[PDB]
């Protein structure tokens with residue numbers, strides 16, 4: 001994972017579980033307890049795994065729950081570090097533009113296999129959003145959606161439609177329903 | 189020199205002088221014209237120098253001018269590879285955060301005395317910025333400032349105040365003036 005996101009995860013873990021737990025978890029994988037991860041770095045995904053496993057150990061929460069909580073709270077971290085993505089927007093357009101935003105952030109990467117966050121209207125008050133990747137961050141994804149709702153103070157209902165791994169390509173499809181009609185048939 | 193930085197320079201050189209100049213300059217130092225530099229690699233400062241010397245020879249431009257133009261164009265390259273440093277920012281904040289950003293980038297390096305890019309307000313509409321290093325990349329520094337102005341679409345006036353060497357440490361201090369007031373006296 002590119003250092004840009006990993007840096008936010010570290011801060012977010014601190015907001016959730018405290019500096020003590022995070023310092024100890026970082027040290028447990030050989031990092032300096034106050035390591036600042038930058039955009040120029042590429043963090044080994046298995047190192048991230050072990051950090052999260054230590055947090056699970058110290059907090060007594062299942063790692064799935066930790067990812068959910070991190071997703072939820074990481075939205076606030078994003079809003080502080082990169083307020084530009086939030087300013088002058090409402091939830092529906094925010095979710096709608098996530099795919100584009102991530103494509104911009106991943107346009108340069110070596111992997112050449114872009115995770116996708118395609119959203120599309122399926123009713124006057126609902127979208128389907130599909131997470132497609134090789135990494136299978138199911139709980140993180142669900143958490144980010146909740147965190148978005150929380151941040152924008154707009155209530156939604158989320159129903160999981162599909163989740164499964166095909167050829168390494170993990171997919172998670174959700175239906176998100178809003179409190180007000182937001183879409184209408186126009187002529188393709 | 190950090191491999192990833194040299195990577196940006198190679199791309200920037202292609203944008204400025206064409207693939208032919210660069211491919212041949214790379215070959216002249218025994219590289220593959222299409223070499224991929226890892227985020228963990230460093231490149232010897234001397235090889236960088238010889239590459240630049242070849243570019244100067246082929247283009248017929250003084251190498252000082254090449255560095256100036258590379259600095260100018262490299263901001264664009266940085267903004268493409270590392271968008272998060274640029275998203276939603278304005279020029280003043282960007283320049284003021286460079287010292288910290290650079291300190292975060294070369295903490296791993298065995299350099300027990302790092303290059304510095306300290307900036308400080310000296311008036312409501314102006315900062316002094318001082319580049320201090322052993323490397324004497326004067327023209328690159330001035331170029332990057334100009335590229336920053338261009339990128340953020342904020343006009344500035346740059347006055348070089350001092351430039352010179354001492355203790356093996358070269359230093360270049362400029363005064364940068366903005367078109368309107370950006371600082372003001374604040375408690376403590």
Ligand code: HEM
Nearest residue numbers: 002004005078082085098105115133135137141144145148
């Ligand atoms: C301003 C808001 C956001 C920013 C700045 C942001 C930024 C990022 C960045 C930099 C990455 C790393 C991509 C890479 O280098 O591989 C990433 C990954 C990811 N983003 Fe976000 N994100 C935002 C909001 C969201 C939201 C709202 C969702 C879902 C609703 C989301 C879902 C994901 C997921 C699931 C990953 C991991 C994808 C993978 O498996 O590679 N993000 N994000």
Ligand code: HEM
Nearest residue numbers: 189190193266273286293294303321323324325329332333
């Ligand atoms: C996001 C934008 C930027 C990034 C990612 C970046 C990154 C880097 C990196 C990785 C180095 C290598 C340090 C080393 O190997 O010793 C470096 C050096 C340098 N940077 Fe930047 N830089 C950025 C913008 C700027 C700006 C705006 C300036 C000037 C205002 C600047 C001035 C310099 C100078 C003068 C050096 C050479 C330092 C020395 O003598 O050792 N950089 N930068």
Ligand SMILES: [Cl-]
Nearest residue numbers: 061062064065
């Ligand atoms: Cl649980």
